[PDB]
A and B are shown apart, each in its own frame.
Chain A
Amino acid sequence: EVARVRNLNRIIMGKYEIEPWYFSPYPIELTDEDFIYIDDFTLQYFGSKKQYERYRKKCTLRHPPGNEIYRDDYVSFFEIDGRKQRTWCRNLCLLSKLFLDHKTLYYDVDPFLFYCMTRRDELGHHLVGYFSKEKESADGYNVACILTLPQYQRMGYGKLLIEFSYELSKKENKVGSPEKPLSDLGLLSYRAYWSDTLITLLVEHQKEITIDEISSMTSMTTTDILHTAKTLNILRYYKGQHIIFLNEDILDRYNRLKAKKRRTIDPNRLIW
């Protein structure tokens, strides 16, 4: 009755209007400002507008500061070392609780090193993907949900962040899961996630291999593989993880591995 009321003013990132999602336990000063003018460089907020130029005369930092792990030809990949980088975890967690319902700042949100994802041009980075985990073995839970800037969705940033998480699952050889209850775009997106890994899981053999192996190279064991077997339309396989078989199907989107699935990342990363 209190913790889920649309409370703020709105979001106006510079010149770009984005309306919100849900509550967070506000100081009502941000609601009192009609703006959430975030910074295009390092994402800070206050109670005025023409002090958005004290950093524009002061700017020596214009991206998240800690360990940039990777950039491909396309976007940079990142981790926040947020033990004493609670300061970047400040504007991480406030933006999160602008847009992330289920956990709450009843504890304080230190205890993991959070995974971020920007893209520099020559002028510099812009956060184009993010989320966190915890340390290890909570409920499995490799697959953790999305953050993205609210204006370049519906094209494959979630695909790229989950294949990021997939490689770092491969270089940790730990098996997990998605979020348990729900995510809004997250449901049918995760159908697509195991779908395109499923077409890269039934194409490359032409024969039948045992199923813990195809529970292996995408690291999704017997809580995922069943609805791979059944929730693409019906793939009757003589159910059993001793062996099921695979078969010829429509393969039609496999006949379209050309649009929005054209690029990925080679495993070149550092470990923890």
Chain B
Amino acid sequence: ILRDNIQGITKPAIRRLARRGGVKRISGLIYEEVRAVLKSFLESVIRDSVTYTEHAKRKTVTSLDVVYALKRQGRTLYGFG
């Protein structure tokens, strides 16, 4: 099945995910702009993800190719495959 639903309503995970670094008391309204910044970052990594896949000419995705893309956007999340 393939139907569009809204996973932009991700989860309120940032009230533990901003609990990864030294976020003090939070005071909110960050949910929509943390939503905006992570949607920008995921769309940035996913369009060159699928770009190598059409240069891969097979309709899966993979990890060595995702780290190829991930360093070519500069934000090289190093070390997984």
Q: Quote the shortest CB–CB distance from A206 to chain B (angstroms).
A: 28
User: Smallest Cβ distance from A241 to chain B, in angstroms?
Assistant: 13
CA–CA, A122 and B9, complex, Å: 48
A137 is an interface residue with CB less than 8 A from chain B: yes
Chain A: interface residue count, which band? under 10
- Chain B residue with minimal CB distance to A137? B4
Interface of B, helix, strand, loop or mixed by DSSP: loop
8 Å CB contacts to A: which residues of B1-21? 4, 6
Q: Whole-angstrom distance between the alpha carbons of A137 and B6 in the complex?
A: 10
3 residue pairs, one from A and one from B, having the closest CB atoms: A137-B4, A136-B4, A137-B6
Interface residues of B (CB under 8 A from A): 4, 6
A248 to B79, CA, bound (A): 55
Residue of A nearest to B5 (CB): A137
**Which A residues are in CB contact (< 8 Å) with B4?**
136-137
In the assembled complex, the CB of A216 is this many whole angstroms from the nearest CB of chain B, namely 13
Question: Looking across the interface, which residue of chain B has its beta carbon closest to that of A138?
Answer: B4
Q: How far is the CA of A136 from the CA of B8 in the complex (A)?
A: 15
Q: Smallest CB–CB gap between B21 and chain A, Å?
A: 28
Task: Give the shortest distance, in Å, between B3 (CB) and chain A (any CB).
Answer: 9
A89-105 residues at the B interface, CB under 8 angstroms: none
Distance A251 CA – B45 CA, assembled complex (angstroms): 44
Residue of A nearest to B4 (CB): A137
Interface string of A126-140 (1 = CB under 8 A from B): 000000000011000
**Closest beta carbon of chain B to A142's beta carbon, Å:** 15
Q: How far is the CA of A137 from the CA of B2 in the complex (A)?
A: 13
B4–chain A nearest beta-carbon distance, Å: 5
Please indicate the chain B residues that have their CB under 8 angstroms from the CB of A136 in the complex: 4
A94, chain B: closest CB distance, angstroms: 30
Contacts of A137 in B (CB 8 A): 4, 6
Alpha-carbon distance between A136 and B6 when the two chains are bound, in angstroms: 10
User: Complex: how many Å from CA A183 to CA B4?
Assistant: 27
Nearest opposing residue in chain B for A136, CB measure: B4
**B65 vs chain A, min Cβ distance (A):** 29
Q: What would be 3 A-B contacts, judged by CB atoms less than 8 Å apart?
A: A136-B4, A137-B4, A137-B6
Report A-chain residues with C-beta under 8 Å of the C-beta of B6: 137
* Alpha-carbon distance A118/B25, docked complex (angstroms): 54
